[PDB]
Design a protein around this ligand. Structure first.
Ligand SMILES: CC(=O)N[C@H]1[C@H]([C@H](O)[C@H](O)CO)O[C@@](O[C@H]2[C@@H](O)[C@@H](CO)O[C@@H](O[C@H]3[C@H](O)[C@@H](O)[C@@H](O)O[C@@H]3CO)[C@@H]2O)(C(=O)O)C[C@@H]1O
Length: 144
């Protein structure tokens, strides 16, 4: 389903899960005082024990800024993949597009390539989208 101005923190089921070729399109904005936010593609929404996170996409505004990606499995974070770019800007709107491929997620921000991330958890296990932190979201759309 298309989601408009969701409640942040957002935790919602992804109807039909994800398949290769599909896009997750997020329109949102960053508050003036943001420190970080994250978009998590999860297996369920359990809090204790904490739901596995197949893909954690985590922009951090400190210093020059970076984006940390990782996977949480059995309540433990794996090895981080850090992209030392920061396309997000405080006080500004953004578009994130996550392209789902057989081997990787490919992420663009504001129609510019940002990063690739190899799957660590099988794609079919993802059933939940989580968005947390200092971020506002105008819309979430899943494109077939
Ligand atoms: C209640 C709360 O604050 N939850 C946040 C958690 C916890 O603080 C954390 O799990 C410890 O209890 O962390 C979230 O942020 C983590 C996540 O971005 C992962 C991704 O790899 O990195 C963690 O920080 C790393 C850091 O990047 C490393 O350099 C190293 O120093 O270790 C730390 C800790 O592992 C983040 O804490 C989370 O989702 O787990 C955000 C939560 O709001």
């Amino acid at each position: 389903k298309k989601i408009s101005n969701p409640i942040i923190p957002y935790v919602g089921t992804i109807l039909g899960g994800l398949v290769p070729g599909e896009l997750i399109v997020l329109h949102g904005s960053i508050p003036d005082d943001a420190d970080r936010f994250q978009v998590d593609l999860q297996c369920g929404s359990s809090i204790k024990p904490r739901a596995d996170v197949a893909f954690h996409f985590n922009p951090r505004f400190k210093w020059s800024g970076c984006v940390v990606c990782n996977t949480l499995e059995r309540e433990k974070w794996g090895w981080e993949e850090i992209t030392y770019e920061m396309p997000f800007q405080k006080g500004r709107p953004f578009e994130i597009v996550i392209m789902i491929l057989k081997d990787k997620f490919q992420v663009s921000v504001n129609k510019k390539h940002l990063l690739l991330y190899n799957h660590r958890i099988s794609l079919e296990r993802i059933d939940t989208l989580g968005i947390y932190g200092k971020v506002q979201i105008k819309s979430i759309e899943f494109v077939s």
